[PDB]
Amino acid sequence: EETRKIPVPANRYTPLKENWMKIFTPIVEHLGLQIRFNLKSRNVEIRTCKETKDVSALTKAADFVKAFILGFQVEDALALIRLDDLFLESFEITDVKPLKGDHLSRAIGRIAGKGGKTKFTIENVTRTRIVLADVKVHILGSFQNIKMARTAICNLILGNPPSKVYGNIRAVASR
RNA sequence: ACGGUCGAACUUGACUAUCUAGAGGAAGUAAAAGUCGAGGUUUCCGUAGGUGAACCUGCGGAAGGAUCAUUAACGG
């Protein structure tokens, strides 16, 4: 029997409560694993049973709930379940340029854009998903889509205006 | 006429300022269609370098630049 454990932070506990149903129903029904929430250590516990085939889904199942730990929505984690080549790439905003204080918050605002729209646009361009943590940035998609969204984000935090990045990312999407 | 006093004014030098005569020199403008062969587009500030400027680059600073989403406890 193979076992997976994934830690949950404190701020991810309440969303884990309100989205638990749509977390275990994709696992036990059409994927067939054993789920529980280890409440003492605050871990997510994955085990095999006698009803397991296609063992790789096991690993996929782990990444499933790991996406929900990182801040992603439930349906995007289902997209990790359904598809076979869908990856996570993560980097800090300061890992590409040293920004301190208000400049770092302004870089966050340039990634997000007013109303979120800029960030929103990049998903409709790149068929990825993006989580903006406190300093971290997480990208969910295929490898070329990850590369394209990562380049768009890095240019957004170089100092390039979000309008220019909007136009050029609409242009580069057509290849 | 000796002397004293007040003292214009004169001569010579310095320091000044003006008026005039000036060879010569360096600029601009008009006449010469004679001759030879850019680029930036986030914006800056203080420094130092890259050929003066321009722009680029190293360090430090600014916004006078477009914040979406989760987010007390519910283990000890």
mmCIF file of C-alpha atoms (C1' of nucleotides) in Angstrom:
data_model
loop_
_atom_site.group_PDB
_atom_site.id
_atom_site.type_symbol
_atom_site.label_atom_id
_atom_site.label_comp_id
_atom_site.label_asym_id
_atom_site.label_seq_id
_atom_site.Cartn_x
_atom_site.Cartn_y
_atom_site.Cartn_z
ATOM 1 C CA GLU A 1 0.000 0.000 0.000
ATOM 2 C CA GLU A 2 1.360 3.378 -1.103
ATOM 3 C CA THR A 3 0.843 6.419 1.098
ATOM 4 C CA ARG A 4 0.981 10.166 0.422
ATOM 5 C CA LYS A 5 0.822 12.988 2.966
ATOM 6 C CA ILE A 6 0.544 16.691 2.124
ATOM 7 C CA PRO A 7 0.662 19.493 4.743
ATOM 8 C CA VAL A 8 -2.046 22.156 4.903
ATOM 9 C CA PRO A 9 -1.402 25.703 6.173
ATOM 10 C CA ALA A 10 -3.727 27.490 8.563
ATOM 11 C CA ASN A 11 -5.123 29.887 5.949
ATOM 12 C CA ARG A 12 -5.929 26.927 3.670
ATOM 13 C CA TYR A 13 -7.986 25.104 6.317
ATOM 14 C CA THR A 14 -11.354 26.826 5.830
ATOM 15 C CA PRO A 15 -11.272 26.502 1.984
ATOM 16 C CA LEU A 16 -10.420 22.841 2.563
ATOM 17 C CA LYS A 17 -13.593 22.598 4.654
ATOM 18 C CA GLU A 18 -15.856 24.364 2.161
ATOM 19 C CA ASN A 19 -14.529 22.401 -0.851
ATOM 20 C CA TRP A 20 -14.045 18.963 0.722
ATOM 21 C CA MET A 21 -16.971 17.361 -1.131
ATOM 22 C CA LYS A 22 -15.675 18.128 -4.638
ATOM 23 C CA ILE A 23 -12.266 16.975 -3.424
ATOM 24 C CA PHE A 24 -13.065 13.445 -2.318
ATOM 25 C CA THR A 25 -15.783 12.704 -4.895
ATOM 26 C CA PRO A 26 -13.322 12.828 -7.858
ATOM 27 C CA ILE A 27 -10.892 10.638 -5.912
ATOM 28 C CA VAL A 28 -13.039 7.746 -4.664
ATOM 29 C CA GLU A 29 -15.519 7.508 -7.548
ATOM 30 C CA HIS A 30 -13.677 7.475 -10.878
ATOM 31 C CA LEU A 31 -10.117 7.306 -9.543
ATOM 32 C CA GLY A 32 -10.477 5.006 -6.528
ATOM 33 C CA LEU A 33 -8.205 5.946 -3.627
ATOM 34 C CA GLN A 34 -8.592 6.376 0.123
ATOM 35 C CA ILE A 35 -8.787 9.940 1.456
ATOM 36 C CA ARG A 36 -8.692 11.451 4.902
ATOM 37 C CA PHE A 37 -7.786 14.679 6.683
ATOM 38 C CA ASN A 38 -5.271 13.880 9.434
ATOM 39 C CA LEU A 39 -6.591 16.470 11.842
ATOM 40 C CA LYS A 40 -3.927 16.179 14.548
ATOM 41 C CA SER A 41 -0.963 16.833 12.245
ATOM 42 C CA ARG A 42 -3.098 18.750 9.692
ATOM 43 C CA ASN A 43 -2.149 16.598 6.726
ATOM 44 C CA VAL A 44 -3.989 15.223 3.710
ATOM 45 C CA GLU A 45 -3.666 11.431 3.625
ATOM 46 C CA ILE A 46 -3.812 9.381 0.412
ATOM 47 C CA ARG A 47 -3.748 5.586 0.461
ATOM 48 C CA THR A 48 -4.280 2.807 -2.041
ATOM 49 C CA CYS A 49 -6.927 0.089 -1.762
ATOM 50 C CA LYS A 50 -7.810 -3.122 -3.583
ATOM 51 C CA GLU A 51 -9.812 -0.985 -6.043
ATOM 52 C CA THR A 52 -6.809 0.741 -7.652
ATOM 53 C CA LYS A 53 -5.775 0.609 -11.294
ATOM 54 C CA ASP A 54 -3.653 3.037 -13.351
ATOM 55 C CA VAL A 55 -1.240 3.637 -10.473
ATOM 56 C CA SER A 56 0.101 6.931 -11.880
ATOM 57 C CA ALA A 57 -3.232 8.574 -10.989
ATOM 58 C CA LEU A 58 -2.103 8.001 -7.395
ATOM 59 C CA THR A 59 0.709 10.506 -7.926
ATOM 60 C CA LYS A 60 -1.709 12.681 -9.909
ATOM 61 C CA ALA A 61 -4.133 12.601 -6.979
ATOM 62 C CA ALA A 62 -1.410 13.989 -4.710
ATOM 63 C CA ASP A 63 -0.712 16.870 -7.088
ATOM 64 C CA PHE A 64 -4.497 17.323 -7.231
ATOM 65 C CA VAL A 65 -4.835 18.397 -3.641
ATOM 66 C CA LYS A 66 -1.403 20.034 -3.723
ATOM 67 C CA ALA A 67 -2.805 22.474 -6.268
ATOM 68 C CA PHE A 68 -5.624 23.261 -3.861
ATOM 69 C CA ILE A 69 -3.002 23.853 -1.179
ATOM 70 C CA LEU A 70 -1.152 26.339 -3.372
ATOM 71 C CA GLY A 71 -4.225 28.522 -3.868
ATOM 72 C CA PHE A 72 -5.672 27.104 -7.072
ATOM 73 C CA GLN A 73 -9.379 26.555 -7.556
ATOM 74 C CA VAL A 74 -10.983 23.126 -7.396
ATOM 75 C CA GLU A 75 -11.754 22.871 -11.125
ATOM 76 C CA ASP A 76 -8.142 23.584 -12.095
ATOM 77 C CA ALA A 77 -7.091 20.763 -9.789
ATOM 78 C CA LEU A 78 -9.648 18.594 -11.599
ATOM 79 C CA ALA A 79 -7.800 19.672 -14.738
ATOM 80 C CA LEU A 80 -4.704 18.144 -13.154
ATOM 81 C CA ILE A 81 -6.748 14.967 -12.647
ATOM 82 C CA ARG A 82 -8.220 14.703 -16.160
ATOM 83 C CA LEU A 83 -5.238 15.732 -18.262
ATOM 84 C CA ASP A 84 -1.964 13.820 -18.381
ATOM 85 C CA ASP A 85 0.538 16.621 -19.141
ATOM 86 C CA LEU A 86 -0.269 19.542 -16.833
ATOM 87 C CA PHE A 87 2.452 21.012 -14.628
ATOM 88 C CA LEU A 88 3.170 23.492 -11.840
ATOM 89 C CA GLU A 89 5.963 26.047 -12.091
ATOM 90 C CA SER A 90 6.671 28.350 -9.185
ATOM 91 C CA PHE A 91 9.006 31.271 -8.588
ATOM 92 C CA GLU A 92 9.268 34.287 -6.325
ATOM 93 C CA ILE A 93 8.933 37.835 -7.627
ATOM 94 C CA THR A 94 12.304 38.687 -6.098
ATOM 95 C CA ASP A 95 13.921 35.604 -7.678
ATOM 96 C CA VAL A 96 14.178 37.544 -10.948
ATOM 97 C CA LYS A 97 14.836 41.089 -9.661
ATOM 98 C CA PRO A 98 15.593 42.560 -6.227
ATOM 99 C CA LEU A 99 12.576 44.695 -5.325
ATOM 100 C CA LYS A 100 12.122 45.913 -1.761
ATOM 101 C CA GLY A 101 9.195 47.546 -0.035
ATOM 102 C CA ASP A 102 6.619 49.435 -2.062
ATOM 103 C CA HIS A 103 8.269 48.459 -5.361
ATOM 104 C CA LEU A 104 7.483 44.804 -4.630
ATOM 105 C CA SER A 105 3.828 45.626 -3.986
ATOM 106 C CA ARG A 106 3.724 47.647 -7.205
ATOM 107 C CA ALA A 107 5.139 44.640 -9.081
ATOM 108 C CA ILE A 108 2.350 42.539 -7.557
ATOM 109 C CA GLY A 109 -0.165 45.116 -8.761
ATOM 110 C CA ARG A 110 1.266 45.030 -12.274
ATOM 111 C CA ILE A 111 0.914 41.246 -12.393
ATOM 112 C CA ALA A 112 -2.640 41.432 -11.085
ATOM 113 C CA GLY A 113 -3.753 44.573 -12.887
ATOM 114 C CA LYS A 114 -6.787 46.657 -12.036
ATOM 115 C CA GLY A 115 -9.753 44.454 -11.186
ATOM 116 C CA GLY A 116 -7.508 41.450 -11.742
ATOM 117 C CA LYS A 117 -8.099 41.935 -15.465
ATOM 118 C CA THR A 118 -4.461 41.814 -16.594
ATOM 119 C CA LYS A 119 -3.863 38.530 -14.784
ATOM 120 C CA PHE A 120 -7.230 37.294 -16.060
ATOM 121 C CA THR A 121 -6.252 38.168 -19.625
ATOM 122 C CA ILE A 122 -3.116 36.040 -19.500
ATOM 123 C CA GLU A 123 -5.117 32.903 -18.692
ATOM 124 C CA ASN A 124 -7.408 33.487 -21.682
ATOM 125 C CA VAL A 125 -4.239 34.002 -23.681
ATOM 126 C CA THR A 126 -2.106 31.190 -22.377
ATOM 127 C CA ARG A 127 -4.620 28.529 -21.178
ATOM 128 C CA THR A 128 -2.763 28.463 -17.847
ATOM 129 C CA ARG A 129 -3.781 29.402 -14.326
ATOM 130 C CA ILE A 130 -1.906 31.774 -12.021
ATOM 131 C CA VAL A 131 -1.827 32.021 -8.221
ATOM 132 C CA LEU A 132 -0.420 35.240 -6.770
ATOM 133 C CA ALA A 133 0.668 34.507 -3.213
ATOM 134 C CA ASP A 134 2.350 37.036 -0.925
ATOM 135 C CA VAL A 135 5.659 36.874 -2.832
ATOM 136 C CA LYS A 136 5.386 33.558 -4.709
ATOM 137 C CA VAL A 137 3.857 33.103 -8.165
ATOM 138 C CA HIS A 138 2.483 29.719 -9.251
ATOM 139 C CA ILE A 139 1.691 28.825 -12.874
ATOM 140 C CA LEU A 140 -0.363 25.806 -13.954
ATOM 141 C CA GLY A 141 -0.261 24.550 -17.521
ATOM 142 C CA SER A 142 1.676 22.779 -20.226
ATOM 143 C CA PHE A 143 5.373 23.488 -20.672
ATOM 144 C CA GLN A 144 5.149 25.928 -23.592
ATOM 145 C CA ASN A 145 2.167 27.661 -21.986
ATOM 146 C CA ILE A 146 4.123 27.882 -18.715
ATOM 147 C CA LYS A 147 7.030 29.433 -20.638
ATOM 148 C CA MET A 148 4.774 31.972 -22.349
ATOM 149 C CA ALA A 149 2.941 33.009 -19.166
ATOM 150 C CA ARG A 150 6.243 33.185 -17.269
ATOM 151 C CA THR A 151 7.730 35.487 -19.909
ATOM 152 C CA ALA A 152 4.617 37.684 -19.786
ATOM 153 C CA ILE A 153 4.858 37.895 -15.984
ATOM 154 C CA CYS A 154 8.602 38.625 -16.005
ATOM 155 C CA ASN A 155 8.092 41.449 -18.494
ATOM 156 C CA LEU A 156 5.211 42.751 -16.367
ATOM 157 C CA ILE A 157 7.595 43.068 -13.426
ATOM 158 C CA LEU A 158 10.577 44.397 -15.435
ATOM 159 C CA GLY A 159 8.744 47.705 -15.455
ATOM 160 C CA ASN A 160 7.015 47.331 -18.807
ATOM 161 C CA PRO A 161 3.543 48.933 -18.827
ATOM 162 C CA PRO A 162 0.674 46.437 -18.552
ATOM 163 C CA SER A 163 -0.884 47.818 -21.743
ATOM 164 C CA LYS A 164 2.172 46.880 -23.816
ATOM 165 C CA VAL A 165 2.260 43.417 -22.252
ATOM 166 C CA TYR A 166 -1.480 43.092 -22.957
ATOM 167 C CA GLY A 167 -1.041 43.889 -26.645
ATOM 168 C CA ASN A 168 2.051 41.760 -27.195
ATOM 169 C CA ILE A 169 0.595 38.792 -25.319
ATOM 170 C CA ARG A 170 -2.522 38.971 -27.479
ATOM 171 C CA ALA A 171 -0.212 38.986 -30.510
ATOM 172 C CA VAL A 172 2.089 36.089 -29.480
ATOM 173 C CA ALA A 173 -0.912 33.855 -28.633
ATOM 174 C CA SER A 174 -1.471 33.103 -32.342
ATOM 175 C CA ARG A 175 1.383 30.625 -32.808
ATOM 176 C "C1'" A B 1 61.556 144.648 -3.593
ATOM 177 C "C1'" C B 2 62.540 140.370 0.745
ATOM 178 C "C1'" G B 3 59.058 137.469 3.345
ATOM 179 C "C1'" G B 4 54.372 135.229 4.863
ATOM 180 C "C1'" U B 5 49.338 133.769 3.622
ATOM 181 C "C1'" C B 6 45.053 132.347 0.450
ATOM 182 C "C1'" G B 7 45.522 130.103 -3.990
ATOM 183 C "C1'" A B 8 43.771 129.343 -9.300
ATOM 184 C "C1'" A B 9 46.684 126.964 -12.682
ATOM 185 C "C1'" C B 10 51.196 124.487 -15.007
ATOM 186 C "C1'" U B 11 55.021 120.239 -15.477
ATOM 187 C "C1'" U B 12 56.403 115.266 -14.469
ATOM 188 C "C1'" G B 13 55.272 110.181 -12.842
ATOM 189 C "C1'" A B 14 51.333 106.333 -10.954
ATOM 190 C "C1'" C B 15 45.949 104.592 -10.436
ATOM 191 C "C1'" U B 16 41.791 105.404 -13.183
ATOM 192 C "C1'" A B 17 37.743 106.704 -16.758
ATOM 193 C "C1'" U B 18 36.204 108.884 -21.344
ATOM 194 C "C1'" C B 19 36.458 110.663 -26.482
ATOM 195 C "C1'" U B 20 38.456 109.702 -31.013
ATOM 196 C "C1'" A B 21 42.185 107.318 -35.276
ATOM 197 C "C1'" G B 22 43.141 102.509 -35.864
ATOM 198 C "C1'" A B 23 46.582 97.802 -39.154
ATOM 199 C "C1'" G B 24 45.165 93.149 -37.771
ATOM 200 C "C1'" G B 25 41.660 89.048 -35.664
ATOM 201 C "C1'" A B 26 37.708 86.095 -34.205
ATOM 202 C "C1'" A B 27 31.450 85.453 -34.794
ATOM 203 C "C1'" G B 28 26.472 85.911 -36.997
ATOM 204 C "C1'" U B 29 23.327 87.080 -41.299
ATOM 205 C "C1'" A B 30 22.124 87.187 -46.893
ATOM 206 C "C1'" A B 31 23.857 85.883 -51.867
ATOM 207 C "C1'" A B 32 27.151 80.248 -54.068
ATOM 208 C "C1'" A B 33 21.554 73.574 -55.701
ATOM 209 C "C1'" G B 34 29.842 74.987 -57.219
ATOM 210 C "C1'" U B 35 33.110 70.326 -54.100
ATOM 211 C "C1'" C B 36 33.255 65.697 -51.372
ATOM 212 C "C1'" G B 37 30.111 61.352 -48.712
ATOM 213 C "C1'" A B 38 19.670 57.830 -36.360
ATOM 214 C "C1'" G B 39 16.152 56.766 -32.750
ATOM 215 C "C1'" G B 40 13.183 56.857 -27.617
ATOM 216 C "C1'" U B 41 8.118 55.392 -26.365
ATOM 217 C "C1'" U B 42 7.587 53.269 -17.839
ATOM 218 C "C1'" U B 43 9.306 57.973 -15.921
ATOM 219 C "C1'" C B 44 13.182 59.684 -13.091
ATOM 220 C "C1'" C B 45 17.208 61.327 -8.844
ATOM 221 C "C1'" G B 46 22.484 61.282 -6.994
ATOM 222 C "C1'" U B 47 27.137 59.468 -8.538
ATOM 223 C "C1'" A B 48 31.143 56.953 -11.789
ATOM 224 C "C1'" G B 49 32.563 54.943 -16.557
ATOM 225 C "C1'" G B 50 31.848 54.119 -21.860
ATOM 226 C "C1'" U B 51 34.784 59.616 -27.072
ATOM 227 C "C1'" G B 52 32.086 66.030 -25.623
ATOM 228 C "C1'" A B 53 26.538 65.859 -26.083
ATOM 229 C "C1'" A B 54 23.162 61.946 -26.708
ATOM 230 C "C1'" C B 55 22.101 57.327 -24.973
ATOM 231 C "C1'" C B 56 23.957 52.784 -22.608
ATOM 232 C "C1'" U B 57 25.995 50.560 -18.092
ATOM 233 C "C1'" G B 58 27.529 49.456 -12.355
ATOM 234 C "C1'" C B 59 25.572 50.958 -7.028
ATOM 235 C "C1'" G B 60 21.898 53.316 -3.933
ATOM 236 C "C1'" G B 61 17.078 55.824 -3.731
ATOM 237 C "C1'" A B 62 11.709 57.389 -5.607
ATOM 238 C "C1'" A B 63 6.384 56.687 -7.825
ATOM 239 C "C1'" G B 64 5.399 61.558 -9.811
ATOM 240 C "C1'" G B 65 3.562 53.250 -12.120
ATOM 241 C "C1'" A B 66 -2.768 49.468 -13.094
ATOM 242 C "C1'" U B 67 -4.132 44.907 -5.814
ATOM 243 C "C1'" C B 68 -6.802 39.985 -8.310
ATOM 244 C "C1'" A B 69 -7.755 35.627 -4.714
ATOM 245 C "C1'" U B 70 -7.196 32.828 0.116
ATOM 246 C "C1'" U B 71 -6.654 34.815 4.881
ATOM 247 C "C1'" A B 72 -9.077 34.533 13.794
ATOM 248 C "C1'" A B 73 -10.083 29.466 16.250
ATOM 249 C "C1'" C B 74 -11.871 24.726 15.164
ATOM 250 C "C1'" G B 75 -4.100 19.995 16.481
ATOM 251 C "C1'" G B 76 -1.320 21.448 21.005
#
